[PDB]
Amino acid sequence: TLDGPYQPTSFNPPINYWLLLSPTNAGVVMQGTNNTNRWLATLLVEPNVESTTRNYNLFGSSVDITVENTSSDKWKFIDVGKTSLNGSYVQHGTLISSTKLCAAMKHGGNLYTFSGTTPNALPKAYSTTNFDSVNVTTFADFYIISRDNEQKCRQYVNNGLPPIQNTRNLE
Ligand SMILES: CC(=O)N[C@H]1[C@H](O[C@H]2[C@@H](O)[C@@H](CO)O[C@@H](O[C@H]3[C@H](O)[C@@H](O)[C@H](O)O[C@@H]3CO)[C@@H]2O)O[C@H](CO)[C@@H](O)[C@@H]1O[C@@H]1O[C@H](CO)[C@H](O)[C@H](O)[C@H]1O[C@@H]1O[C@@H](C)[C@@H](O)[C@@H](O)[C@@H]1O
C-alpha cells in the first residue's frame, strides 16, 4: 500500500491510523467533528509571532483566536477544540517543530496528537470523551500510517520526510 501523499479531502478516518499532515502555510491545518460534542482543529503559527488575534476559518465560521509563537525559528502547531456547537474554542497541546509536520490518530477512544519540541515530540492522548466517530477535513497534503508503523510516523514528525515521494519503500 501507498501511504501518500494524498491531497486535501474529507473523510471519517478508521481507528488505529495516523494522519500525517504536511502544511505549507500558517492557518488551519485540519479540522474534525462528530457533530455531537466535539469540533476540533489544528492551527499552524509561523516562527517569531507576538501575541496577536488572527482569523481562522473553522467549519466555515470566522473565528478570532489570540495566538503567539515565542520560538525564534520553529513553527508552532496548536490543538484547539470546543465541546458544544456554539462553545468557545480552547487551546490545548502544542507542537514546536522544525519539520512543519503534525499528526493525529484515533485509538482506544482517545485522540492522539504529537506534542513537545522536535526531535523529541511524542504522541499524547486526549480522553475527555470517546473520539472514535470524529471525522476529518484536511487542508494540507497528508500521509496515512498504521499504528503498527507508528515508529515511522514518529520518525517523520521529528526528523522530516524523505526527499522523494517514496515513503512507501523508505524507513
Ligand atoms: C504501548 C505503550 O506502552 N504506550 C503506547 C500507547 O498504548 C496505550 C494505548 O493503547 C491506550 C489506549 O487506551 O491503552 C494503554 O494502556 C493503558 C490505558 O491507556 C489506560 O486507560 C489504562 O488505565 O491503563 C493502561 C496501561 O496498560 C496502552 O498502553 O499508545 C500510544 C498511541 O499509539 C503509543 O504512542 C504508546 O507507545 C509508547 O509510547 C511511549 C512514550 O510515551 C514509548 O515511546 C513506548 O516505547 C511506546 O510503545 C511503542 O509504541 C507503541 C505504539 C507500541 O507499538 C509498543 O509496542 C511500542 O513499544
Author numbering: 64 to 234
Article, verbatim:
The P genotypes are further classified into five genogroups, P[I] to P[V], based on the sequences of the spike protein VP8*, one of the two proteolytic fragments of VP4. It has been found that almost all P genotype RVs in P[II], P[III] and P[IV] groups that commonly infect humans recognize histo-blood group antigens (HBGAs) of the host through VP8* in a genotype dependent manner. In the present study, using a multiphasic approach, including X-ray crystallography, glycan microarray with a dedicated probe library, bio-layer interferometry, site-specific mutagenesis, and molecular docking and dynamics simulations, we found that P-VP8* can bind to all blood group A, B and H(O) antigens but on type 1 chain only, without the capability to bind to any Lewis epitopes or mucin O-glycan cores.
To understand the structural basis of the interactions between P-VP8* and the type 1 HBGAs, we selected H-T1 pentasaccharide, LNFP I, for co-crystallization with the VP8* protein as the type 1 blood group A and B epitopes share the similar linear sequences LNFP I with an additional GalNAc and Gal residues, respectively. The structure of P-VP8* in complex with LNFP I was determined at a resolution of 1.29 Å. The bound ligand LNFP I showed clear electron density. The edge part of the glycan binding site was composed of β-strand K, I-J loop, and 210-loop (residues 210213, which links the β-strand M and α-helix A), while the base part was formed by W81, M168, and Y175. The binding of H-T1 pentasaccharide involves a network of both direct hydrogen bonding interaction and stabilizing hydrophobic contact. Apart from the reducing terminal Glc(1), all the other four monosaccharide residues Gal(2), GlcNAc(3), Gal(4) and Fuc(5) participate in the interactions. Gal(2) is in direct hydrogen bonding with H170 and N173. The main interactions are with GlcNAc(3), which formed two hydrogen bonds with E213 and one hydrogen bond with R210, in addition to hydrophobic interactions with W81, M168, Y175, and R210. Gal(4) participates in two hydrogen bonding interactions involving the side chain of R217 and also hydrophobic interactions with L185 and P186. However, R217 of P-VP8* has direct hydrogen bonding with the nonreducing Gal residue of LNFP I, and therefore is the key amino acid for selective binding to T1 backbone chain, whereas in the case of P -, P -, and P-VP8*s of the P[II] group RVs, the VP8* interaction with the Gal is through E212.
